[PDB]
Design an enzyme around this catalytic site. Structure first.
Site, PDB file in Angstrom:
ATOM      1  N   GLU A  90       3.408  -7.052 -47.296  1.00 22.29           N
ATOM      2  CA  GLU A  90       4.169  -7.117 -46.050  1.00 22.29           C
ATOM      3  C   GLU A  90       4.078  -5.749 -45.357  1.00 22.29           C
ATOM      4  O   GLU A  90       3.987  -4.706 -46.021  1.00 22.29           O
ATOM      5  CB  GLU A  90       5.635  -7.482 -46.304  1.00 22.29           C
ATOM      6  CG  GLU A  90       6.424  -6.453 -47.102  1.00 22.29           C
ATOM      7  CD  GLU A  90       7.916  -6.732 -47.153  1.00 22.29           C
ATOM      8  OE1 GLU A  90       8.485  -7.229 -46.162  1.00 22.29           O
ATOM      9  OE2 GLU A  90       8.527  -6.450 -48.195  1.00 22.29           O
ATOM     10  N   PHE A  91       4.069  -5.773 -44.030  1.00 25.12           N
ATOM     11  CA  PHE A  91       4.062  -4.554 -43.229  1.00 25.12           C
ATOM     12  C   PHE A  91       5.489  -4.155 -42.876  1.00 25.12           C
ATOM     13  O   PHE A  91       6.286  -4.992 -42.443  1.00 25.12           O
ATOM     14  CB  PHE A  91       3.237  -4.755 -41.956  1.00 25.12           C
ATOM     15  CG  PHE A  91       3.260  -3.568 -41.023  1.00 25.12           C
ATOM     16  CD1 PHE A  91       2.459  -2.453 -41.270  1.00 25.12           C
ATOM     17  CD2 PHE A  91       4.094  -3.563 -39.913  1.00 25.12           C
ATOM     18  CE1 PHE A  91       2.487  -1.341 -40.409  1.00 25.12           C
ATOM     19  CE2 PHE A  91       4.136  -2.459 -39.054  1.00 25.12           C
ATOM     20  CZ  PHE A  91       3.326  -1.353 -39.301  1.00 25.12           C
ATOM     21  N   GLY A  96      -2.220   5.345 -44.154  1.00 26.05           N
ATOM     22  CA  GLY A  96      -2.192   6.550 -44.972  1.00 26.05           C
ATOM     23  C   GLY A  96      -2.724   6.330 -46.368  1.00 26.05           C
ATOM     24  O   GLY A  96      -3.303   5.284 -46.666  1.00 26.05           O
ATOM     25  N   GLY A 104      -1.492   6.784 -50.403  1.00 33.93           N
ATOM     26  CA  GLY A 104      -0.406   7.012 -51.349  1.00 33.93           C
ATOM     27  C   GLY A 104      -0.923   7.489 -52.691  1.00 33.93           C
ATOM     28  O   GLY A 104      -1.886   8.245 -52.758  1.00 33.93           O
ATOM     29  N   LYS A 126      10.588   9.313 -53.266  1.00 30.96           N
ATOM     30  CA  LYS A 126      10.619  10.313 -52.211  1.00 30.96           C
ATOM     31  C   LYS A 126      10.694   9.523 -50.906  1.00 30.96           C
ATOM     32  O   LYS A 126      10.379   8.324 -50.891  1.00 30.96           O
ATOM     33  CB  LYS A 126       9.357  11.185 -52.281  1.00 30.96           C
ATOM     34  CG  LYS A 126       8.044  10.412 -52.334  1.00 30.96           C
ATOM     35  CD  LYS A 126       6.838  11.339 -52.276  1.00 30.96           C
ATOM     36  CE  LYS A 126       5.547  10.542 -52.341  1.00 30.96           C
ATOM     37  NZ  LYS A 126       4.357  11.417 -52.479  1.00 30.96           N
ATOM     38  N   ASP A 173       8.801   7.906 -58.566  1.00 33.80           N
ATOM     39  CA  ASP A 173       8.225   8.551 -57.379  1.00 33.80           C
ATOM     40  C   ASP A 173       9.055   8.248 -56.132  1.00 33.80           C
ATOM     41  O   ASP A 173       8.516   7.983 -55.054  1.00 33.80           O
ATOM     42  CB  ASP A 173       6.755   8.140 -57.196  1.00 33.80           C
ATOM     43  CG  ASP A 173       5.986   9.061 -56.233  1.00 33.80           C
ATOM     44  OD1 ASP A 173       6.355  10.246 -56.082  1.00 33.80           O
ATOM     45  OD2 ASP A 173       4.988   8.588 -55.645  1.00 33.80           O
ATOM     46  N   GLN A 228       8.896   9.332 -48.346  1.00 37.32           N
ATOM     47  CA  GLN A 228       7.608   8.773 -47.928  1.00 37.32           C
ATOM     48  C   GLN A 228       7.350   7.378 -48.512  1.00 37.32           C
ATOM     49  O   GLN A 228       6.569   6.588 -47.949  1.00 37.32           O
ATOM     50  CB  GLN A 228       6.469   9.719 -48.337  1.00 37.32           C
ATOM     51  CG  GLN A 228       6.432  11.036 -47.546  1.00 37.32           C
ATOM     52  CD  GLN A 228       7.311  12.166 -48.108  1.00 37.32           C
ATOM     53  OE1 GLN A 228       8.118  11.982 -49.028  1.00 37.32           O
ATOM     54  NE2 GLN A 228       7.152  13.354 -47.529  1.00 37.32           N
ATOM     55  N   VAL A 233      -6.199   3.409 -50.244  1.00 34.17           N
ATOM     56  CA  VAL A 233      -5.967   3.720 -48.829  1.00 34.17           C
ATOM     57  C   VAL A 233      -5.268   2.521 -48.185  1.00 34.17           C
ATOM     58  O   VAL A 233      -5.637   1.369 -48.451  1.00 34.17           O
ATOM     59  CB  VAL A 233      -7.304   4.027 -48.090  1.00 34.17           C
ATOM     60  CG1 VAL A 233      -7.071   4.327 -46.610  1.00 34.17           C
ATOM     61  CG2 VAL A 233      -8.044   5.191 -48.758  1.00 34.17           C
TER      62      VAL A 233
HETATM   63  C1  LIG Z   1       4.232   4.216 -49.373  1.00 33.77           C
HETATM   64  C2  LIG Z   1       3.041   5.008 -48.840  1.00 33.77           C
HETATM   65  C3  LIG Z   1       2.061   4.191 -47.989  1.00 33.77           C
HETATM   66  C4  LIG Z   1       0.777   4.973 -47.734  1.00 33.77           C
HETATM   67  O1  LIG Z   1       1.079   6.205 -47.069  1.00 33.77           O
HETATM   68  N1  LIG Z   1       2.694   4.038 -46.685  1.00 33.77           N
HETATM   69  C5  LIG Z   1       3.065   2.831 -46.218  1.00 33.77           C
HETATM   70  N2  LIG Z   1       3.669   2.753 -45.010  1.00 33.77           N
HETATM   71  C6  LIG Z   1       4.060   1.572 -44.486  1.00 33.77           C
HETATM   72  N3  LIG Z   1       4.653   1.499 -43.276  1.00 33.77           N
HETATM   73  C7  LIG Z   1       4.940   2.693 -42.491  1.00 33.77           C
HETATM   74  C8  LIG Z   1       3.880   3.051 -41.497  1.00 33.77           C
HETATM   75  C9  LIG Z   1       3.511   2.142 -40.518  1.00 33.77           C
HETATM   76  C10 LIG Z   1       2.539   2.504 -39.589  1.00 33.77           C
HETATM   77  C11 LIG Z   1       1.942   3.766 -39.650  1.00 33.77           C
HETATM   78  C12 LIG Z   1       2.316   4.682 -40.633  1.00 33.77           C
HETATM   79  C13 LIG Z   1       3.298   4.320 -41.557  1.00 33.77           C
HETATM   80  C14 LIG Z   1       3.830   0.407 -45.206  1.00 33.77           C
HETATM   81  N4  LIG Z   1       4.075  -0.909 -45.010  1.00 33.77           N
HETATM   82  C15 LIG Z   1       3.630  -1.581 -46.113  1.00 33.77           C
HETATM   83  N5  LIG Z   1       3.088  -0.673 -46.943  1.00 33.77           N
HETATM   84  C16 LIG Z   1       2.502  -0.653 -48.284  1.00 33.77           C
HETATM   85  C17 LIG Z   1       3.558  -0.834 -49.394  1.00 33.77           C
HETATM   86  C18 LIG Z   1       1.012  -0.968 -48.537  1.00 33.77           C
HETATM   87  C19 LIG Z   1       3.217   0.523 -46.436  1.00 33.77           C
HETATM   88  N6  LIG Z   1       2.830   1.713 -46.947  1.00 33.77           N
END
Ligand SMILES: CC[C@H](CO)Nc1nc(NCc2ccccc2)c2ncn(C(C)C)c2n1
Lengths: 269, 267
Positions: free
Chosen positions: B82-83, B12, B14, B130, B128, B132, B18
């Site tokens: 980190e994911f 996504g 933020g 929220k 911020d 999301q 991207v």
């Molecule tokens: C905080 C908003 C960011 C962008 O929409 N969403 C998101 N979402 C994350 N994980 C949720 C997600 C996983 C797979 C698909 C959609 C959302 C995520 N993990 C690490 N990161 C960052 C801090 C770069 C993540 N960022």
């Protein structure tokens, strides 16, 4: 109230005291710069004061920019003709960090009188970020001063402005001020301003907060006093000009005290 | 510089840049890559990136998203994070019918307050908060994310940017345009989030600034929440920023005496 963050101010102070040690530039660095000197650095800092005035920037932004410059020059050799380019990029970075409405890049190019190009400024911005490893949230004299000011009873606007004036003067002169931490310069500046205006001394409540006594502050205090006394004869005059204004209660017009009347046990002292 | 990363899917967008899901081919590590374009002939590195990188490098806490690396190319900046598997908004939507168990709500709120207390203790306003921007994993952790709108503050605070916090989570002191706002604004947001976890509906979903203010005025002058829960919520949503509970004080509230760390609750 919450604007003074009662639940966190001590945590924040302790953290800032940790970080100022980590963000400290190299004390001797100019000795290792083959092409530039403390005198050239003074010209640069004085120019940044003017820029800050012209664009009505926060004093915090000015302090940040100086920290970035000193840290950059602690790591990177810079030729004389490029010193102002480092300074311009630093002020741009500090502005992006600190300002609600930073000036646009074109304004930073304009203030350098077209010696440098916009591309040069932008490429230098990137280089400075690399060299500093994006570590830009540095503690400043200003950040400690605003915390120190809260210990006033009541607040004195002339004391606040004069302390800021003195803190600002310290940015100009790498010798001696590079060897002192921001918290220490702020402490010496606050005392010197308090004494000049009211005759009061560094408060006991700040002794408990900071762990600093007039005894530990003496070396910095003596340096700052001498700087204050010699200020009208300094080659660099932008800070004095700035602090003549009503905004800062015309504090640069005040007469410095002849002596600090510090404690001296011996009969002959 | 990005040879070792294989892009998997777009996550996504933020505050800036991207975000992509990617895998490190050498270690197997799954990461989130935030791609930031510069801007090399006009405005340079955005202030949002400068602030987020500088602050996230400082902030190491279990409940703040980990910034792993910054990859510094000529025309692009890549932040390696980190994911995390899910965000709280998607999790709440997925739980619209089932609801979210109170122990998980309690755990999430406790962790969010721990993360926020850490931020405020290190002079950082998030601004911020929220759903999301709150990220969850399979193990029961929740973390603060997207520090693009964050700010290092001074003591005492001075006037900062007014266009902060998305409308629904915006504290009254911002809505009314007070010259100062502080750590209390983040607490307001988390209070709104607390309520939203219980109901799976935004507490104050205003259509405009006036509608937003009217919705707040109605409620203050959440059914399934106990006495301790409602006590904490009312303190998090105090009108007066001075009287509003701090994150520190919130962690000590009776509501958390029996806190655990449950696993979600859905995948
Ligand atoms: C905080 C908003 C960011 C962008 O929409 N969403 C998101 N979402 C994350 N994980 C949720 C997600 C996983 C797979 C698909 C959609 C959302 C995520 N993990 C690490 N990161 C960052 C801090 C770069 C993540 N960022």
């Amino acid at each position: 109230s919450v604007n003074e963050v009662p639940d966190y101010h001590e945590d924040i102070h302790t953290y800032l005291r940790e970080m100022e040690v980590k963000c400290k530039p190299k004390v001797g660095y100019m000795k290792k710069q083959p092409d530039i000197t403390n005198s050239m650095r003074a010209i640069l800092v004085d120019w940044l004061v003017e820029v800050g005035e012209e664009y009505k920037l926060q004093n915090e932004t000015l302090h940040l920019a100086v920290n970035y410059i000193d840290r950059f020059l602690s790591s990177m050799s810079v030729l004389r003709g490029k010193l102002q380019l480092v300074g311009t990029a630093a002020m741009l970075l500090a502005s992006k960090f600190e300002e609600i409405y930073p000036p646009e890049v074109a304004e930073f190019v304009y203030i350098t009188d077209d010696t440098y190009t916009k591309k040069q400024v932008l490429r230098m911005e990137h280089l400075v970020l690399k060299v500093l490893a994006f570590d830009l949230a540095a503690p400043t004299i200003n950040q400690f001063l605003t915390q120190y000011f809260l210990h006033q009873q009541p607040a004195n606007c002339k004391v606040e402005s004069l302390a800021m004036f003195l803190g600002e003067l310290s940015l100009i002169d790498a010798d001696p001020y590079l060897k002192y931490l921001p918290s220490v310069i702020a402490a010496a500046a606050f005392h010197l301003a308090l004494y000049t205006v009211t005759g009061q001394s560094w408060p006991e409540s700040l002794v408990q907060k900071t762990g600093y006594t007039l005894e530990t502050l003496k070396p910095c205090l003596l340096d700052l006093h001498q700087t204050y006394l010699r200020a009208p004869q300094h080659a660099q005059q932008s800070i004095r000009e700035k602090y003549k204004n009503s905004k800062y209660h015309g504090v640069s017009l005040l007469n410095p005290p002849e002596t600090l009347n510090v404690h001296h046990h011996h009969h002959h002292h | 510089s990005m040879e070792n990363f294989q892009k998997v899917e777009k996550i996504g967008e933020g505050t800036y840049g991207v975000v992509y899901k990617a895998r490190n081919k050498l270690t197997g590590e799954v990461v989130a890559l935030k791609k930031i374009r510069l801007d090399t002939e006009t405005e340079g590195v955005p202030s949002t990136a400068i602030r987020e990188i500088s602050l996230l490098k400082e902030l190491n806490h279990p409940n703040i998203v980990k910034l792993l690396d910054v990859i510094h190319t000529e025309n692009k900046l890549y932040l390696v994070f980190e994911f995390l598997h899910q965000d709280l908004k998607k999790f709440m939507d997925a739980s619209a019918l089932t609801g979210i168990p109170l122990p998980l709500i309690k755990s999430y709120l406790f962790q969010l307050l721990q993360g926020l207390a850490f931020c405020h203790s290190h002079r950082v306003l998030h601004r911020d908060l929220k759903p999301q921007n709150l990220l969850i994993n399979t193990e029961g952790a929740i973390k603060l994310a997207d520090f693009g709108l964050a700010r290092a503050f001074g003591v005492p605070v001075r006037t900062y940017t007014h266009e902060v916090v998305t409308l629904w989570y915006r504290a009254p002191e911002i809505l009314l345009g007070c010259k100062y706002y502080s750590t209390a604004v983040d607490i307001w947001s988390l209070g709104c989030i607390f309520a939203e976890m219980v109901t799976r509906r935004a507490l104050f979903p205003g259509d405009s600034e006036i509608d937003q203010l009217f919705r707040i005025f109605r409620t203050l002058g959440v059914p399934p929440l106990d006495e301790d829960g409602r006590s904490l919520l009312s303190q998090m949503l105090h009108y007066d920023p001075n009287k509003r509970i701090s994150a520190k004080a919130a962690l000590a509230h009776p509501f958390f005496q029996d806190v655990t760390k449950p696993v979600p609750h859905l995948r």
